[PDB]
Amino acid sequence: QLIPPLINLLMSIEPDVIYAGHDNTKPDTSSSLLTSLNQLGERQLLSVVKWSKSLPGFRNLHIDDQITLIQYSWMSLMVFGLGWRSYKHVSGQMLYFAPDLILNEQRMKESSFYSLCLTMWQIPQEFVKLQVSQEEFLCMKVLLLLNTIPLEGLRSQTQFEEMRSSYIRELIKAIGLRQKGVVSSSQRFYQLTKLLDNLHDLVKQLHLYCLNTFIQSRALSVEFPEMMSEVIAAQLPKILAGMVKPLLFHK
Numbered sequence: 001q002l003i004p005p006l007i008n009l010l011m012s013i014e015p016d017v018i019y020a021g022h023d024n025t026k027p028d029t030s031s032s033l034l035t036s037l038n039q040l041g042e043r044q045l046l047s048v049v050k051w052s053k054s055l056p057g058f059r060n061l062h063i064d065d066q067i068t069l070i071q072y073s074w075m076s077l078m079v080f081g082l083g084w085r086s087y088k089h090v091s092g093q094m095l096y097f098a099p100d101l102i103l104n105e106q107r108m109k110e111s112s113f114y115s116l117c118l119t120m121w122q123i124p125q126e127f128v129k130l131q132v133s134q135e136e137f138l139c140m141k142v143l144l145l146l147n148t149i150p151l152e153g154l155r156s157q158t159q160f161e162e163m164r165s166s167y168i169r170e171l172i173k174a175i176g177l178r179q180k181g182v183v184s185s186s187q188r189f190y191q192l193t194k195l196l197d198n199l200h201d202l203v204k205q206l207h208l209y210c211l212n213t214f215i216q217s218r219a220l221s222v223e224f225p226e227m228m229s230e231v232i233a234a235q236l237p238k239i240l241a242g243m244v245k246p247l248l249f250h251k
């Protein structure tokens, strides 16, 4: 009754928790972990498609465009909510991939991925640091779904731009529910938008990591599943060559 109505719909359409189905039983090797991660990733991109089909405005873009923006955000979405969920249930002090897959410091001993898990870990730190609320989270995550377009833009640019705007303004709502300044509320906005502007670069490291484990998978002994494989082949190279338009909040 103080929660703006979209922010309650955001609540409700949020997915239920996805397990990794991870054997836990026997001792992690670095291929098995990598493989669970993926299976877990598969189950999360199904959940993103479902999620997108109820989010107000997503389905009145052109099919294509809806396919392009998911293909283009799924890493950045995955990473974000590992943030979120790490921050919410383990104090940002452990990486909460899933209920059945939680990584403490021990566990990323075997590197490959030690270094990368450091970098994933930045996000739940910044959330702890910023004391990010649920409402602001719901709104910035839609923002990352709308964060990057083709260099030639979208088929439904205009609706796009409308939808982006109407969720930038939903975030100024949420920011509003607690930062009652006009000074503070501003700086907060600034801060919640640099935070997003910042996960580009962090993402381009997952990205480059995910393609080279892709490509060396057979060497590596790492199974990628089908849905995950297709978005990687489809967009990752192109993304990684910087043949996409990052939307910036700041200059």
Ligand SMILES: C[C@]1(O)CC[C@H]2[C@@H]3CCC4=CC(=O)CCC4=C3C=C[C@@]21C
Residues within 6 Å of the ligand: 034, 037, 038, 040, 041, 044, 075, 078, 079, 081, 082, 097, 206, 209, 210, 213
């Ligand atoms: C192992 C790897 O191929 C590279 C980085 C891994 C990513 C990191 C982002 C991530 C966090 C989640 O909440 C979903 C599982 C998850 C992944 C599963 C597979 C990936 C994409």
